[PDB]
Amino acid sequence: LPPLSLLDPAEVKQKSYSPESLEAMSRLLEIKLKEFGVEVSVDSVHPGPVITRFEIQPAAGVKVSRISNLAKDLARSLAVISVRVVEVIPGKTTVGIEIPNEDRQMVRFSEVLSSPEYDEHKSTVPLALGHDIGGRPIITDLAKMPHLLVAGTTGSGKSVGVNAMLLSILFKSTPSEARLIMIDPKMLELSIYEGIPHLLCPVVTDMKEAANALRWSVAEMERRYRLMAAMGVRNLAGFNRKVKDAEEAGTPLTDPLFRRESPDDEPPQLSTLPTIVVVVDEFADMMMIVGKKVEELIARIAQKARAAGIHLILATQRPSVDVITGLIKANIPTRIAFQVSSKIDSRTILDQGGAEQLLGHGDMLYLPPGTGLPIRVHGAFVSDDEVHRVVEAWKLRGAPDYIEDILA
Amino acid sequence: LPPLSLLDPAEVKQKSYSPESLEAMSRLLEIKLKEFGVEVSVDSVHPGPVITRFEIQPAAGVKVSRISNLAKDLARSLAVISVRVVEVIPGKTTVGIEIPNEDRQMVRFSEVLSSPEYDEHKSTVPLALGHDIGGRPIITDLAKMPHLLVAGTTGSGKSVGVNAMLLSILFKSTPSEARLIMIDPKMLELSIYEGIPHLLCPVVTDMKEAANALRWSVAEMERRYRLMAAMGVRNLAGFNRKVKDAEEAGTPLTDPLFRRESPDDEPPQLSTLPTIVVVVDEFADMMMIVGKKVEELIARIAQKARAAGIHLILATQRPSVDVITGLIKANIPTRIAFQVSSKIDSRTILDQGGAEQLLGHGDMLYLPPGTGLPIRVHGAFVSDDEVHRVVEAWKLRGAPDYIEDILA
Ligand SMILES: Nc1ncnc2c1ncn2[C@@H]1O[C@H](COP(=O)(O)OP(=O)(O)OP(O)(O)=S)[C@@H](O)[C@H]1O
Ligand SMILES: Nc1ncnc2c1ncn2[C@@H]1O[C@H](COP(=O)(O)OP(=O)(O)OP(O)(O)=S)[C@@H](O)[C@H]1O
Ligand SMILES: [Mg+2]
Ligand SMILES: [Mg+2]
């Protein structure tokens, strides 16, 4: 219900990337790559808001992996700050060489959310990530992911990305449509959402309580499954349809699971269930303080919480095999990698290299479900101050409704 | 003569840094520092265009060097990208803790040059650096430096800084007022100035020719000294005064050094001498390819070229003791350090730590002459494209005038 006008306006886009300099760079590219062990010719150029992609056609034989490993050296020989090598460009035989624009224009949240893709999204938990390399809005749906793993080192834009996702939901769903459980071992990053009506419990700081929060989630998931079974529905959307039709028909449904034990008892009237999202700002700590029990709970939620409408968003600044385990990854195919420190760290999160070539400040590689190759997305910027406003707007529309059993 | 309108406009400054969040951060700071081995209390807050400085008053005893070493950990504990620790604040007993603003506003060249400090600067070689932490224009004078050393690692803003300095001169001085010798071993960064009338020779790429360029400079310096001696003047400003007064008096001076050897010979009429600037994009190579001969020439130019109106600007991306030797430093007190990789690298350039705590993208520590402490300056941004325009504007006002003896 809170107005999008609470956000900061989109900034001017004084672009101008004269075809002049673009031909020269194309020219330099071929020259510089040649000095290395690779023959190449520029096929086309695509200027964007943050980067410019120069599609190139390698000579037969040359291993594209060879170009990828030359990224550092090529950027140097070109005197540019960074270079991202795109090994394969969907639908083409060309290789991508992406180069940062001198004056990159920031991508504002208000800009992404003002897109029809978002304004008309039906999901209860859409996530407006940002703009793609051509500047087109990239709006996703957490419900279809159906879980998300997020990594990136300091200054990469992980926390801003996490806030953009929380605000995507807060701008489209009311507390009866979506509820959240936030886990933030340190105080900082997520402490500000404290109090909004969407919260199921206060921001979790204690790791043991974090563990309980996941157990509660599992319990609620199985509880929703018994409900859906008793109702003859396959998922949350179906459940909510049934309950909604019965009401509109002047015949509200009664909890088919309620067992009367006292003459006094009356079956409670069913109501639509909210989509639940569990967001962990940093779960490397959980995986360290608690351990195996945490993996177990995560792995269980990931495997079957989708139908129950319970979704996980796990973010980590420490992308190690100890934190992002194969057990965690096996049931969470959707990945988002902001800038990471090494190719090794890139593979742990994406099972692929490349996130080490990102710029930082929101720059990311998004790996949607049933996709082998990630698409580059320029994370939308949302300031802690904008977060504070929306949060205040929500604390005015409803008081906190914590359930002191979740952390118990 | 080329119009400032050739530059890009200053971008909006949607700031807003509510005193709210500033009190909280002041609050966290004391909290977080306490967790480390340091008691502290915030005395005041000064929000700026790029950073916000929180002055703090350490408890008696605690070593300010202790806070400096905690910058990394402190930034981490605060969940911010970077923290700069200012050990002493001129005229105060406080210590500075500088924190980057979420949405930093870029500082545009047009904005700095539009300041009266620049527009009314008399020097032939003023260098508009950018904005200080409070957003005030910092315009310097190369002639009073009288030489400048510049360091910074990749993506720090060294080359943008060097272009802003070259354009500072190109927007105030005509070729009869200022001439340049550009040395750029690689092609990239400085190759674009090729052809402007100000150039004394083509952009130098060969290291041996770079060596000759420096020798020519020494020769020209001594030649100007004999000229000034013969004219009874102490410096270039004085020389140019004399030659200018004589002309206005209908009596142009004659080269007092010209020795007639033929009946044919006629003493040439003197003319005002241009201020000469030698800019090396990367002299780490020179110091490596040639060696000791290059140190010697640099050391000689640095020691006595000021009066002769000849000035050096030496920039390096590889700040090692092998490159920035004490010999070089003894005669070049003015320093500019953009972000560097380590405290060691910071000491090599500033003989002090701190450049390792910079943000990059133009952020710098400027050490003016007769000063022990550097002032933070947010470098003014100038795109390669803006440089291209100004270059074209100059190539229309004058043809190249190379002296094929300088590199010979
Ligand atoms: N999408 C973005 N667009 C522009 N700047 C961004 C973006 N995301 C992040 N930044 C910059 O980085 C800051 C926020 O970074 P975070 O998202 O908190 O980074 P982090 O990866 O969580 O690591 P930290 O700094 O340790 S919190 C902002 O204040 C900006 O200055
Ligand atoms: N003063 C500045 N303001 C904003 N962005 C800047 C500034 N200086 C540098 N940048 C960014 O960095 C780029 C230029 O960096 P350079 O100044 O060439 O860096 P460098 O330190 O010389 O190292 P490179 O990238 O190896 S050339 C610009 O294209 C911008 O994207
Ligand atoms: Mg963070
Ligand atoms: Mg450079």
Curated annotation (Swiss-Prot), chains A, B:
Boundaries of the shown chain within the full protein: 315 to 722 of 811
Complex formation: Homohexamer. Forms a ring that surrounds DNA.
Domain FtsK: 135-347
Free-text domain note: Consists of an N-terminal domain, which is sufficient for the localization to the septal ring and is required for cell division, followed by a linker domain, and a C-terminal domain, which forms the translocation motor involved in chromosome segregation. The C-terminal domain can be further subdivided into alpha, beta and gamma subdomains. The alpha and beta subdomains multimerise to produce a hexameric ring, contain the nucleotide binding motif and form the DNA pump.
Keyword terms: ATP-binding, Cell cycle, Cell division, Cell inner membrane, Cell membrane, Chromosome partition, DNA-binding, Membrane, Nucleotide-binding, Transmembrane, Transmembrane helix
Positions of disulphide bridges: none
Entry's localization field: Cell inner membrane
Gene Ontology molecular functions: ATP binding; DNA binding; DNA translocase activity
Binding site for ATP: 155-160, 361, 379-380
Function statement: Essential cell division protein that coordinates cell division and chromosome segregation. The N-terminus is involved in assembly of the cell-division machinery. The C-terminus functions as a DNA motor that moves dsDNA in an ATP-dependent manner towards the dif recombination site, which is located within the replication terminus region. Translocation stops specifically at Xer-dif sites, where FtsK interacts with the Xer recombinase, allowing activation of chromosome unlinking by recombination. FtsK orienting polar sequences (KOPS) guide the direction of DNA translocation.
Stretches in topological domain Cytoplasmic: 1-408
UniProt name for this protein: DNA translocase FtsK
Stated family: Belongs to the FtsK/SpoIIIE/SftA family.
GO BP, one annotated term: cellular response to antibiotic
Gene Ontology CC: one annotated term: plasma membrane
Membrane topology, record value: Multi-pass membrane protein
Organism: Pseudomonas aeruginosa (strain ATCC 15692 / DSM 22644 / CIP 104116 / JCM 14847 / LMG 12228 / 1C / PRS 101 / PAO1)
The keyword DNA-binding belongs to this UniProt entry's keyword annotation: yes
Entry annotated with the keyword Protein transport: no
